[PDB]
Design a protein around this ligand. Structure first.
Ligand SMILES: *[C@@H]1O[C@H](CO)[C@@H](O[C@@H]2O[C@H](CO)[C@@H](O)[C@H](O)[C@H]2NC(C)=O)[C@H](O)[C@H]1NC(C)=O
Ligand SMILES: *[C@@H]1O[C@H](CO)[C@@H](O[C@@H]2O[C@H](CO)[C@@H](O)[C@H](O)[C@H]2NC(C)=O)[C@H](O)[C@H]1NC(C)=O
Ligand SMILES: *[C@@H]1O[C@H](CO)[C@@H](O[C@@H]2O[C@H](CO)[C@@H](O)[C@H](O)[C@H]2NC(C)=O)[C@H](O)[C@H]1NC(C)=O
Ligand SMILES: *[C@@H]1O[C@H](CO)[C@@H](O[C@@H]2O[C@H](CO)[C@@H](O)[C@H](O)[C@H]2NC(C)=O)[C@H](O)[C@H]1NC(C)=O
Ligand SMILES: *[C@@H]1O[C@H](CO)[C@@H](O[C@@H]2O[C@H](CO)[C@@H](O)[C@H](O)[C@H]2NC(C)=O)[C@H](O)[C@H]1NC(C)=O
Ligand SMILES: CC(=O)N[C@@H]1[C@@H](O)[C@H](O)[C@@H](CO)O[C@H]1O
Ligand SMILES: *[C@@H]1O[C@H](CO)[C@@H](O)[C@H](O)[C@H]1NC(C)=O
Ligand SMILES: *[C@@H]1O[C@H](CO)[C@@H](O)[C@H](O)[C@H]1NC(C)=O
Ligand SMILES: *[C@@H]1O[C@H](CO)[C@@H](O)[C@H](O)[C@H]1NC(C)=O
Ligand SMILES: *[C@@H]1O[C@H](CO)[C@@H](O)[C@H](O)[C@H]1NC(C)=O
Ligand SMILES: *[C@@H]1O[C@H](CO)[C@@H](O)[C@H](O)[C@H]1NC(C)=O
Ligand SMILES: *[C@@H]1O[C@H](CO)[C@@H](O)[C@H](O)[C@H]1NC(C)=O
Ligand SMILES: *[C@@H]1O[C@H](CO)[C@@H](O)[C@H](O)[C@H]1NC(C)=O
Ligand SMILES: *[C@@H]1O[C@H](CO)[C@@H](O)[C@H](O)[C@H]1NC(C)=O
Lengths: 428, 192, 179
């Protein structure tokens, strides 16, 4: 069964890359600016320095993940003024200069689809003190020593990295990953890529416009798909949710008595005096420190998750953006052609564009051909017959040719191989 | 507040506001030490100069937020000064802002990195992403290599760790039989 | 961990023997329980951190074994898997609690601009490079491998024909020498 027509499909692969760089002050969460509780806490020693060290490692690790994912090229390339690409329309993925930021149209859709429940990365003192009618969650976290540090790389700069990667991929193929970035017409990158999947380049040139149109149409459908279905980005949204959820539970755990008379330190201290007050304070301290330890442990597990995902994303960037991946279903279902990166809050998105055989026909075949007793095997492709004539054709596309000595090779004779048939080899 | 309600509480069930018994007005309570403080510094053995980032504050309102009137003088010099710089992360004090972009040395955040430079002082700047480069694309132009090089790179990977082992009885009790006997009530923690 | 033996955890003292020499079971056991739970907590924390780091190190070790298999025992086609550049080989070297790979790679060094075209028309039929690309220095058309300048004269054994030169975009007029 040989394909005769094909299609170019575009698939979306979403990968989380980073998390919110949380940080925690023990003294506020546990004690709340009370010197006596801090003094009792000092008896516990280096629990809190250990927690702070762990969370600092988490933050540094997230920044490293983002850097090693996106910053794989040390030259900031920019698209040329002339968008001549042999009919291939790259306008929904490149930066829009009229737009304030350099986010692409698709990137704008992505940022507008997933919701970042953090009130942005700015929340001033006066912002919280004016927001006394709603009791904002983020303010409640902030007053209890829970802070969200900003990422080192802002979205402007991630977008710049992606634009540079796209410029290198489109104008230079894989050469910009291997040392210096050269220049190649895009159709010739396509020719190389088709050669990479065992497809002769000549077919693409023979249908070039169609393929470009298909690609462009596919891109449009992505834009149509992404603009309606919210669940598509769930893989990222849940991450945010999970982190938020954790913080919420943590602050709610300040309401727990843990067997104490009250959850409020000041109530105990105003009601009770050291010899038996310290017992209740110890109970509260161990409960809250337990909650913090649990939170940090969960964050560490999730960080191992996200580092695995980020390593996978960097591998995809290296093997599919900076090159063509022979790994099957590594960069989307189908014979991989390319992948385009797009940023996203705490994650990345790959538009994997792939070849898929579309229409096929049954034919009759045979491994070899006997000419004068000697057995001829296809140098490339396979022997095929339409019932009257034998031809040779590439495996993944119907394109017969007349059998000739320069299309086949001879090894042995036709009395040994199974399935050989009688025919003639035209001798030029 | 309802007539029978005396205290209000937030999500954390800490007292958020109080109705003053004498003058029936409601006052919110906020912690004194609001706002993290991060110290940017070159390593010791080189210099003792530092800079301070106050996160998510306006440089106009840094002193009131940090309660600068109450601190010691050596914190008040970093509370306000001529090297005050605003950034999306917060207010940075003790480092002069530099237009020139460089590679990151110490990351602050929001694209801002600092370093120590000799003007013998600490500088803060927007990081350089790398040299800006452009590509001479055209529909009928190729760039072909004619010479090459063989390069050697080093890739370091940790493989193992120290095979630590722990005896509970020594660490927890220290060869004391009574403490071990009390420990046995806990069961199979230590075997685990 | 050893410093956490100095912690009282709310007890009168961090030393077991002091409590036992000063206090007797009915209320001594409470302080002893406090110390035991604190120290067992510290141990549990240490073991948890060690487990996380062990998962890290196993991931790194699996990656290192993969590099050894795919770059020392073979040549890796994976881009930037074994160092920046077209991978040639990797050499292992030991190290305390780790390994080091000397990845030796090819990198194009000097380059020149040239003029190109996908195909060549000879007598109406379109010729495509069997390998490499068509290139011109302004006077003659040659075929050359992608990653190194090495032109040759175009011949029928360097190209192949498919269709005609009225369909492909960018084809140019030239001649194919017939041996
Ligand atoms: C091979 O299949 C493709 C579709 O996968 C065909 O493209 C369509 O052809 C029909 C009929 O010519 C047109 O009406 C459509 O507009 C084409 N698609 C697009 C996106 O334009 C292609 O024609 C087929 N080729 C052969 C030789 O059968
Ligand atoms: C790429 O596709 C777009 C279709 O989205 C072509 O037309 C542009 O479409 C956008 C949005 O639909 C409009 O804002 C522009 O005004 C359209 N351009 C024109 C010239 O009408 C666009 O032309 C295509 N790119 C190329 C190079 O043809
Ligand atoms: C393919 O052609 C060969 C050559 O003619 C055939 O070999 C002959 O087969 C007949 C079958 O009865 C024998 O009597 C002859 O002695 C064979 N001659 C030789 C030189 O081998 C072969 O049978 C043909 N096979 C098919 C499937 O057509
Ligand atoms: C191709 O480039 C290499 C360097 O990458 C050249 O090698 C150097 O050539 C110069 C001039 O001949 C010598 O002085 C150097 O000693 C060479 N390098 C070494 C390490 O010995 C090489 O000559 C170039 N080849 C061509 C044809 O230009
Ligand atoms: C390449 O050569 C062909 C063959 O001579 C050219 O085709 C001719 O083009 C002229 C242009 O005015 C027409 O008047 C002739 O009728 C064409 N003849 C044939 C047989 O096609 C073609 O124009 C040339 N192209 C280039 C770029 O030089
Ligand atoms: C030291 C230096 O170059 N400072 C300049 C400053 O004078 C100027 O106002 C600003 C842009 O407005 O750019 C920076
Ligand atoms: C190939 O043959 C099978 C069984 O004879 C049939 O079901 C199928 O439709 C055929 N496909 C084509 C393209 O003829
Ligand atoms: C098979 O291909 C030959 C090639 O010339 C053609 O003449 C013949 O009509 C074809 N037969 C069928 C059934 O397709
Ligand atoms: C293929 O199978 C058929 C029966 O299904 C059999 O008659 C034929 O001999 C087989 N092919 C060869 C080369 O033996
Ligand atoms: C630390 O100081 C000593 C002596 O002053 C010097 O030998 C050493 O190089 C210094 N280290 C660094 C990292 O500057
Ligand atoms: C407070 O910060 C905003 C932006 O966060 C800024 O526009 C404003 O100027 C600042 N306040 C003053 C008094 O400048
Ligand atoms: C190639 O052309 C571009 C633009 O014309 C130019 O900047 C570059 O230096 C050229 N390179 C060579 C090797 O001639
Ligand atoms: C192009 O190559 C041919 C090959 O013989 C040579 O004769 C000619 O001088 C070259 N021209 C340039 C400009 O390099
Ligand atoms: C390549 O682009 C130029 C303008 O930049 C144009 O004149 C030329 O026709 C294009 N090439 C082809 C084969 O059309």
């Amino acid at each position: 069964a040989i394909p005769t027509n094909f299609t170019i499909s575009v698939t979306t692969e979403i990968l989380p890359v980073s998390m919110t760089k949380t940080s925690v002050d023990c003294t506020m969460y546990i004690c709340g600016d009370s010197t006596e509780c801090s003094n009792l806490l000092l008896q516990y020693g280096s629990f809190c320095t250990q927690l702070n060290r762990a969370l600092t490692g988490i933050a540094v690790e997230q920044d490293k993940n983002t850097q090693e994912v996106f910053a794989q090229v040390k030259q900031i390339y920019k698209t040329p003024p002339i968008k001549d690409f042999g009919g291939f329309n790259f306008s929904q993925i490149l930066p829009d200069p009229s737009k304030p930021s350099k986010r692409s149209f698709i990137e704008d859709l992505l940022f507008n689809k997933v919701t970042l429940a953090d009130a942005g990365f700015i929340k001033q003192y006066g912002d919280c003190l004016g927001d006394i009618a709603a009791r904002d969650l983020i303010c409640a976290q902030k007053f209890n020593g829970l802070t969200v540090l900003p990422p080192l790389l802002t979205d402007e700069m991630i977008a710049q990295y992606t634009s540079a990667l796209l410029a290198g991929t489109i104008t230079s193929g894989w050469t910009f990953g291997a040392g210096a970035a050269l220049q190649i017409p895009f159709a010739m990158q396509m020719a190389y890529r088709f050669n990479g999947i065992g497809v002769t380049q000549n077919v693409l040139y023979e249908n070039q416009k169609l393929i470009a149109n298909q690609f462009n149409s596919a891109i449009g459908k992505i834009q149509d798909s992404l603009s309606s279905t919210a669940s598509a980005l769930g893989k990222l949204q849940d991450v945010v949710n999970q982190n938020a959820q954790a913080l919420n539970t943590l602050v709610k755990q300040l309401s727990s008595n843990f067997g104490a008379i009250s959850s409020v330190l000041n109530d105990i201290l105003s009601r009770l005096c050291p010899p038996e007050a310290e017992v209740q304070i110890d109970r509260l301290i161990t409960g809250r420190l337990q909650s913090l330890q649990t939170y940090v442990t969960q964050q560490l597990i999730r960080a191992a998750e996200i580092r695995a995902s980020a390593n996978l994303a960097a591998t995809k960037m290296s093997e599919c953006v900076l090159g063509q991946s022979k790994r099957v279903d590594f960069c989307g279902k189908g014979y991989h052609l390319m992948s385009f990166p797009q940023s996203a809050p705490h994650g990345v998105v790959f538009l994997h564009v792939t070849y898929v055989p579309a229409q096929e026909k049954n034919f009759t075949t045979a491994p070899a051909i006997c000419h004068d007793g000697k057995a001829h095997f296809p140098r490339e492709g396979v022997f095929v017959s339409n019932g009257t004539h034998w031809f040779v054709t590439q495996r993944n596309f119907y394109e017969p040719q007349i059998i000739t000595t320069d299309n086949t090779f001879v090894s042995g004779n036709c009395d040994v191989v199974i399935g050989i048939v009688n025919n003639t080899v035209y001798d030029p | 507040f309802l007539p029978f309600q005396q205290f209000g509480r937030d999500i954390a069930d800490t007292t958020d506001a109080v109705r003053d018994p004498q003058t029936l007005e409601i006052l919110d309570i906020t912690p004194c030490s609001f706002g993290g403080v991060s110290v940017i510094t070159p390593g010791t053995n080189t210099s003792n100069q530092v800079a301070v980032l106050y996160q998510d504050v306006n440089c106009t309102e840094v002193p009131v937020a940090i309660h600068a009137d109450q601190l010691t003088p050596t914190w008040r010099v970093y509370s306000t000064g001529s090297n005050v710089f605003q950034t999306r992360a917060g207010c940075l004090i003790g480092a002069e802002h530099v237009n020139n972009s460089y590679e990151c040395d110490i990351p602050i955040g929001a694209g801002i990195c600092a370093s120590y430079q000799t003007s013998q002082s600490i500088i803060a700047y927007t990081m350089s992403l790398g040299a800006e480069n452009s590509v001479a694309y055209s529909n009928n132009s190729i760039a072909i290599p004619t010479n090459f090089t063989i390069s050697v790179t080093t890739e370091i990977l940790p493989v193992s760790m120290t095979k630590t082992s722990v005896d509970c009885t020594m660490y927890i009790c220290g060869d004391s039989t009574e403490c071990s006997n009390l420990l046995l009530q806990y069961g199979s923690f230590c075997t685990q």
